[PDB]
């Protein structure tokens, strides 16, 4: 199952995932492609931050879904 | 058809829409339900900002998709 | 998260809020602390009135921000 991950301005990247993959597992794959550490990625789908212990299936993320990648930094 | 609209931290609302509805029309529906003027709304789906002139079908936004709402904020 | 609420000439009140708390909830907390009915409260940040159905994070309000309370 392929999903897409995209920043607002950036290029779409394509990942092969299983519906049972955890968000942590997806972030590990994003780190391999874009270099951003998992703890500084946040993935947004359906207007919700995707929590790391949960699976793609939990959020009803299906084939061809596009996750929104934002950069999360400690500040303020 | 119903779609959902949600800010990152807020609870979701639903709008009654048609595939041919423009993003402009969607923003008008949001104003009707939430009191946010269309020019204070930034809408995101599939990691893309949605353009006012396009329609929902133009973005492959389907029944029970959730748009991500971000406010446009200005000092004063 | 800690935020502050001030009238222009009044005491500063500190509130415990969550980023996802709605302005309505924030007014409820001010009622609990200060005894001001929410219908008498207007909250302002960056010169703009904050609407009841929005959250603190909707308005990009960070920790230790000061909201201005007008009655």
């Amino acid at each position: 199952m392929q999903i897409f991950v995209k920043t607002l301005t950036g290029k779409t990247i394509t990942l092969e995932v299983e519906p049972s993959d955890t968000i942590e597992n997806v972030k590990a794959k994003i780190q391999d492609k874009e270099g951003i550490p998992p703890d500084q990625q946040r993935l947004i789908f359906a207007g919700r931050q995707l929590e790391d212990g949960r699976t793609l299936s939990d959020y009803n993320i299906q084939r061809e879904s596009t996750l929104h990648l934002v950069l999360r930094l400690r500040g303020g | 058809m119903q779609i959902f609209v949600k800010t990152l931290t807020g609870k979701t609302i639903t709008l009654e829409v048609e595939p041919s509805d423009t993003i402009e029309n969607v923003k008008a529906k949001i104003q009707d339900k939430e009191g946010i003027p269309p020019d204070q709304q930034r809408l995101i789906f599939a990691g893309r900002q949605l353009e006012d002139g396009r329609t929902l079908s133009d973005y492959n936004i389907q029944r029970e998709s959730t748009l991500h709402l971000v406010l446009r904020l200005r000092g004063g | 998260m800690q935020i502050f609420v001030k009238t222009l000439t009044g005491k500063t009140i500190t509130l415990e809020v969550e980023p996802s708390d709605t302005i309505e909830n924030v007014k409820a907390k001010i009622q609990d602390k200060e005894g001001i009915p929410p219908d008498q409260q207007r909250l302002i940040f960056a010169g703009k009135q904050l609407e009841d159905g929005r959250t603190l994070s909707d308005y990009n309000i960070q920790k230790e921000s000061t909201l201005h309370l007008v009655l």
Partner: nanobody
Amino acid sequence: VQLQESGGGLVQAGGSLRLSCAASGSIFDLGRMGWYRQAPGKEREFVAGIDYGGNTNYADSVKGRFTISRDNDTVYLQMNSLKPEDTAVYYCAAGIVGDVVGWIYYLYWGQGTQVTVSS
């Protein structure tokens, strides 16, 4: 390109440098702009932020040395008393607070400007 950094370069320790970020469209209307940096072999680190109320905040390691500001179409980072450890690629970004206190979600960020502080 919504955000374009410039004004980097090579500067001697103790010197000063002003970074600029040209902001296009309505990128400011997210309500929060920031600078973060990435030094060699290190993770990205928040440096300074400013919200639409004009409120600023700074990393502890730059507080008192760096000043963030913005005009109608530019975010600035005035960097005084530069130190070798300020060497990094510096990025401007626009974003929002999230569900957890003390974190910023940057939705847009630039390509970066290199700052090198020599001795």
